[PDB]
Amino acid sequence: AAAAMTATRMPSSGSSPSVPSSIIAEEKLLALLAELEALSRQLAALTQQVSELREQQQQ
């Protein structure tokens, strides 16, 4: 009634960026698709000359 009455008396907000580091970029990209063919070409050339041992030993 008196004394104190003179003054006065959720779910999901879904953030995303959190506490990780900063990020950067560059545009000098992508030789790498050539080596996948270099590697599998030269791999064949190994077997090709293993065959050239065998095809001369068989003579």
Partner 1 sequence: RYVPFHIQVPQKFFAIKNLLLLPGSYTYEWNFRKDVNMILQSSLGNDLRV
User: Where do contacts with partner 1 occur on this chain (CB under 8 A)?
Assistant: 13, 15, 17-19
Distances (CA, A) of 30 to 6, 33, 35: 74, 7, 11
Nearest approach in angstroms of CB 7 to partner 1 is 14
Shortest Å, Cβ 25 to partner 1: 21
Report, in Å, the least distance between residue 16 CB and partner 1: 8
Q: Could you give the CA distance from residue 6 to residue 54 in angstroms, rounded to a whole number?
A: 106
- 3-state SS, residue 38: helix
Between residues 13 and 57, which has the closer beta carbon with respect to partner 1? 13
